[PDB]
Design a protein around this nucleic acid. Structure first.
Ligand SMILES: [K+]
Ligand SMILES: [Mg+2]
Ligand SMILES: [Mg+2]
Ligand code: NA
Ligand code: NA
Ligand code: NA
Ligand code: NA
Ligand SMILES: [Zn+2]
Lengths: 140, 210, 84, 88, 84, 25, 205, 129, 72
RNA sequence: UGCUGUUGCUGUUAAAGGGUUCGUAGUUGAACUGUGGGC
RNA sequence: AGUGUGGAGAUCGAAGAUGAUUAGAAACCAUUGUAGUCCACACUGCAAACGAUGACACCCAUGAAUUGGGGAUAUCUUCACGUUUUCUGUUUUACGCGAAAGCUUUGAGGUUACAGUCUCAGGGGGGAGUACG
């Protein structure tokens, strides 16, 4: 969007004012918490867990049903990912780009885009170390 | 004003007043549309024609009467129409009230050139079409003359003060509109308490082919 | 002193950077495609005097079957358009 | 109380300009475009009462085409027009 | 016309056209529905703007279809809206 | 004269000066 | 004198015997005799600043004309300016005086701090611009005088201001625009809405 | 990136006032914005305003009565002593008879006339006249 | 637009003025020690010398005259 | 002499926006924990 | 455009050659023609590299259109189109500003009624983007 490039889009989601779960949801908060632990065991990431709960289960927002966020639940049960999810997906993209470039060496457009993702990694990794979500002396 | 002081409700859009507006198609407007007139537009029918709401159209009609009839000298007011279709309407309208009329091509500088022997300094100026009477409206601004205009759906509502949303492109439409104003102003002045009906003929106001 | 708000070509403030040049029809000068004056011309092969003679002597062409024409697109430089 | 008076108690204002009825803008002498409109009042019978209501608008409003909008709003507040339609 | 709008209490026709984040108070645009499944005799809750695959019990093939907007409903089923 | 031609003259003089300095050193 | 306008007839018929009536209703003035009728002949001083020639190139040579600037005022809160051109320098002098009398404008004066006695300074900071010349006027304490250039100072005296601070910018050596910019600064003093005129204004016919 | 909420809010009111509008919407708001408006409301330069709650930085709808000429914010917020009041009025105010300079002090947000009465200095926040 | 307005940005403003002050021809000449080096008087107001020759310098156009000068 | 411009300058065509990006010191940085009541 | 090393060499074509033209033609015109032009790798780092207009954010009047996505409710074939809203781009046609030419929801507007944040340059014309390092 705006960090790198000229994009100026505004697509997002708007949360409701009334944070009370609907009266037709009969599931107790114990079952919801038990159900995000099972999904996390399947190997799904926190973002994917919320979409599965919302799409086919009627739980629009976990925090409004159980009172705590998805990552908080996983951290309590010791199932959180080793490194933060957004940092994990950026490193995966940069690894595929470098694999592509080692064969197509004249692809000068992908070399410019590769420069931008590694600058994003360094800005992201600097923030996590400050709030101590990553070990000190962590390098990509 | 449709709302009469003390809640008399004497001046209202009765049934008989209604058919006259629809018979002569005084509510059918042009397919074009301007932002100034967007409030007075009610909806769009087939062939893109825009329709003016009768209530606000009738409301503006009464207000113009209360301004024309508020002058001490009826000869002071001037009514202009450069279109040939309104020459008959402006003539006989002036006959019953006493105002002055002008038709044809407007000689520029009439309201500003003191040397010219045709100097006219009215306090109220009335036109038929704002688009084709730009010269009269433009000169009126320099001398602090208010303007009452008959505006179609598309109209450059600039320097005008009281606008009557109606149709002024047809022979029947123009003649019918001056009938309501001429009939109204005399009733407020006290010539006829009700004037229901009135022996005056609308086709006399109509611009018959000469 | 700017003479034209479009600077003599149909390229606004910034939407393109470069347009492929083309040769003028008469002199062959290279000019950008959006700046060159472009017209498409369809013309008759023969004029009225010659068409009547050929049509009369041809068992193929006549009142019903019309004669073929020449269709071309012509792009000129700004100088060659004024002189012509 | 309109105008400026010194502590002595004398009004120093040589004249008091009119105020626009739409934007409360002081009408100036050099305008030559502002207008004044008088609207008559009619009693139950249907005849004028011999007096009028006066409102003044600035020349800027006329020169922008917004005079019609201002008048259609001023006349509603003062009672010389009906804000809504009737009921069947 | 003849009526002056209020920015704190807008009319229905004005607010119905606005973007969700451009309203006076922003809110959601989606809802939930009840589905009777192509063949299953069960009840499922499906999001309107669902992007993941959703199945059933007795007709576990597809309850909807992903789309750039609202999910496409599978034919031969029953859908009804729900409050809140 | 044309600024481009003047710049060409300057370039030629500078090249000659560099060659002369190298030979004289 | 035969008046040629309705307003001129009223001043001839003594119906309108005050200058504020024209200012109140913003009526344009078409004859200079109205000002002479409405103001005593001893309280209207007029002076001419400077006259310079202007030339237009013709096929066989040039043509020269002269432009004259005039200023009128009663030293009590009225001022007017005018500038006319003529083939003869004498003719331009006559025309300028007529034009200035048709541009009489009221000037508002106020107090710096204590409101005792008579007004001596402009009420609030104002500025006027014509061409590239801009003149700023700032209220001054009592017993200061007119701190201004010789040309703007003469205009301010005719207006009736006693203490003021001034400043200028742009090409002030262009005296055609310097005279016209000072007039706009003074004319703007009656357009400001101070809290002393907030409400309770009554209309008139 | 928006760096000052107060500067943005004061610029919206002045722009809307110059155009002769009757109401204006301010977004977003804060404690300082509301306190600034209450000083203008006390002296009669604005009408009644409403604060809408939306579980975020809310919005304010302000009614204008045509009595305001210009309002603005001073950035950076320079420090003003009790002796520096005379220099600030002489610079950013049209005259010594009307207009107000708003300061934030230990006592609270107040105009310069009130602050001088209580013998307090502070930081300049803005002005209105 | 063309300025920095931060509260703690006094160092930037100090360096901006110091550097741009050299663009003044008058200011730079006063503050450069190379000044008065090319001045024959050496910075003083008067000087004494010995007259060695008399010359005549023509006047620049559009004036025609011979100005009597002396080389010292 | 607001022609050194913090108050207080200019940068389309008069003197002057870097060919485009990334980036470290530096400068700048969203909302919230608070209407005291009664006589 | 130019440089180095290997390819390629159709077209066009700096240098050059031969005709025209011209007091004169080194040029403009005609016929040719080498380096170039094309490719890979390695250098160079400059352009009327222009919107002659630095980046980020807020407000702002009217009428056009048009590109991509989404929401609601008249026609054609066995997806396209019609009407009205909406988000992002991309152009044409008021207050206000400017010395003017002109700019104007995408400002050169909201500025002597002068303060949203950062940053790069300028200080009469030449010498000169030259000399020394
Ligand atoms: K280019
Ligand atoms: Mg330049
Ligand atoms: Mg060849
Ligand atoms: Na000074
Ligand atoms: Na040739
Ligand atoms: Na190549
Ligand atoms: Na360059
Ligand atoms: Zn050509």
């Amino acid at each position: 969007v705006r960090m790198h490039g000229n994009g100026r889009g505004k697509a997002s989601s708007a949360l409701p004012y009334r944070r009370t779960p609907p009266a037709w949801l009969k599931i107790a908060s114990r079952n919801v918490v038990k159900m995000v632990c099972k999904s996390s065991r399947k190997g799904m990431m926190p973002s994917q867990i919320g979409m599965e709960l919302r799409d086919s289960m009627g739980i629009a927002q976990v925090k409004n049903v159980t009172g705590r966020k998805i990552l908080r639940i996983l951290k309590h049960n010791g199932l959180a990912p080793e490194i933060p999810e957004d940092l994990y997906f950026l490193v995966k993209r940069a690894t595929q780009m470098r694999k592509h470039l080692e064969r197509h060496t004249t692809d000068r457009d992908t070399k410019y885009r590769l420069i931008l993702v590694e600058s994003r990694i360094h800005r992201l990794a600097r923030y996590y170390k400050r709030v101590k979500q990553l070990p000190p002396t962590w390098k990509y | 004003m449709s709302a009469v002081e003390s809640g008399s409700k004497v001046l209202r859009m009765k049934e008989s007043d209604a058919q006259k507006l629809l018979a002569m198609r005084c509510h059918i407007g042009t397919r074009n549309q301007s932002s100034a007139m967007k409030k007075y537009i009610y909806g769009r029918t087939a062939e893109g024609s825009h329709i003016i709401d009768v209530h606000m159209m009738w409301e503006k009609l009464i207000l113009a009467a209360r301004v024309i009839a508020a002058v001490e000298n009826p000869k002071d007011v001037c009514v202009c129409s450069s279109r040939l279709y309104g020459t008959r309407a402006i003539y006989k309208f002036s006959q019953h009230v006493g105002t002055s009329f002008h038709g044809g091509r407007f000689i520029p500088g009439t309201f500003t050139n003191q040397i010219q022997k045709k100097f006219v300094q009215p306090r109220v100026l009335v036109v038929t079409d704002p688009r084709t009477d730009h010269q009269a409206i433009r000169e009126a601004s320099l001398v602090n003359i208010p303007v009452i205009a008959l505006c179609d759906t598309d109209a450059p509502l600039e320097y005008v003060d009281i606008a009557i949303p109606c149709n002024n492109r047809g022979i029947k439409s123009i003649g019918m509109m001056y009938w309501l104003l001429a009939r109204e102003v005399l009733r407020l002045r006290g010539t006829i308490v009700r004037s229901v009906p009135w022996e005056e003929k609308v086709d006399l106001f109509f611009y018959r082919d000469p | 002193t700017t003479k034209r708000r479009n600077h003599g070509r149909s390229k606004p403030a910034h939407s393109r950077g470069r347009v492929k040049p083309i040769h003028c029809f008469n002199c062959g000068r290279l000019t950008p495609k959006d700046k060159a004056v472009g017209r498409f011309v369809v013309r008759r092969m023969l004029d009225a005097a010659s068409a009547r003679d050929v049509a009369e002597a041809s068992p193929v062409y006549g009142a019903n079957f019309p004669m073929p024409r020449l269709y071309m697109k012509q792009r000129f430089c700004i100088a060659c358009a004024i002189h012509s | 109380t309109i105008g400026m008076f010194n502590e002595e108690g004398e009004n120093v204002d040589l004249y008091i300009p009119r105020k626009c009825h739409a934007t409360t803008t002081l009408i100036e002498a050099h305008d030559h475009a502002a207008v004044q409109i008088s609207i008559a009042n009619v009693g139950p019978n249907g005849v004028i009462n011999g007096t009028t209501t006066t409102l003044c608008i600035a020349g800027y409003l006329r020169s922008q085409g917004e005079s019609d909008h201002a008048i259609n709003h001023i006349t509603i507040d003062r009672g010389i027009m009906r804000i809504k339609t009737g009921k069947p | 016309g003849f009526f002056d709008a209020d920015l704190s209490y807008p009319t229905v026709r004005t607010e119905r056209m606005k973007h969700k984040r451009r309203r006076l108070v922003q809110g959601p645009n989606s809802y939930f529905m009840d589905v009777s499944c192509p063949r299953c005799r069960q009840v499922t809750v499906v999001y309107s703007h669902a992007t993941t695959s959703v199945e059933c019990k007795g007709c576990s093939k597809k309850l909807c279809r992903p789309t750039g907007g609202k999910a496409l409903l599978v034919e031969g089923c029953g859908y009804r809206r729900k409050p809140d | 004269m044309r600024p481009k031609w003047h710049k060409k003259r300057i370039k030629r003089l500078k090249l000659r000066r560099r060659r002369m300095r190298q030979r004289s050193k | 004198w035969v008046p040629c306008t309705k307003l001129g007839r009223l001043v001839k018929a003594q119906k309108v015997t005050s200058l504020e009536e024209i200012f109140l209703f913003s009526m344009p003035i078409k004859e200079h005799q109205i000002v002479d009728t409405l103001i005593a002949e001893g309280q209207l001083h007029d002076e001419m600043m400077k006259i310079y020639p202007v030339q237009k190139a013709t096929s066989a040579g040039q043509r020269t004309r002269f432009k004259a600037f005039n200023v009128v005022g009663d030293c009590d809160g009225h001022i007017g300016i005018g500038a006319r051109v003529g083939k003869e320098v004498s003719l331009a002098i006559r025309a300028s005086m007529i034009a200035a009398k048709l541009n009489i404008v009221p000037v508002r004066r106020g107090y710096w701090g204590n409101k005792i006695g008579e007004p001596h300074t402009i009420p609030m900071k104002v500025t006027g611009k014509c061409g590239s010349v801009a003149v700023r006027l700032v209220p001054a304490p009592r017993g200061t005088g007119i701190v201004a250039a010789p040309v703007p100072k003469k205009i301010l005296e005719f207006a009736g201001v006693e203490d003021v601070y001034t400043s200028s910018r742009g090409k002030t050596r262009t005296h055609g625009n310097l005279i016209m910019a000072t007039f706009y600064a003074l004319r703007k003093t009656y357009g400001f809405l101070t809290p002393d005129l907030w409400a309770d204004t009554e209309p008139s016919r | 990136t928006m760096m000052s909420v107060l500067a943005n809010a004061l610029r919206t009111i002045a722009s809307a006032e110059r155009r002769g509008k009757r109401q204006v919407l301010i977004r977003p708001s804060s404690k300082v914005v509301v306190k600034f408006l209450q000083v203008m409301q006390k002296h009669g330069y604005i009408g009644e305003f409403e604060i809408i709650d939306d579980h975020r930085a809310g919005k304010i709808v302000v009614n204008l009565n045509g009595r305001l000429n210009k309002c603005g914010a001073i950035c950076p917020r320079f420090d003003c002593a009790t002796t520096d009041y005379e220099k600030w009025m002489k610079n950013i105010l049209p005259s010594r008879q009307f207009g107000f300079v708003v300061l934030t002090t230990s006592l609270g947000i107040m105009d310069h006339e009130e602050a001088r009465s209580r013998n307090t200095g502070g930081k300049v926040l803005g002005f209105f006249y | 637009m063309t300025k920095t307005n931060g509260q703690n940005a006094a160092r930037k403003l100090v360096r901006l003025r110091c550097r741009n002050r050299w663009a003044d021809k008058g200011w730079k000449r006063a503050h450069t020690f190379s000044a008065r080096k090319a001045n024959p008087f050496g910075g003083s107001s008067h000087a004494k010398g010995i007259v060695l020759e008399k010359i005549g310098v023509g006047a620049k156009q559009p004036n025609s005259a011979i100005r009597k000068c002396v080389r010292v």
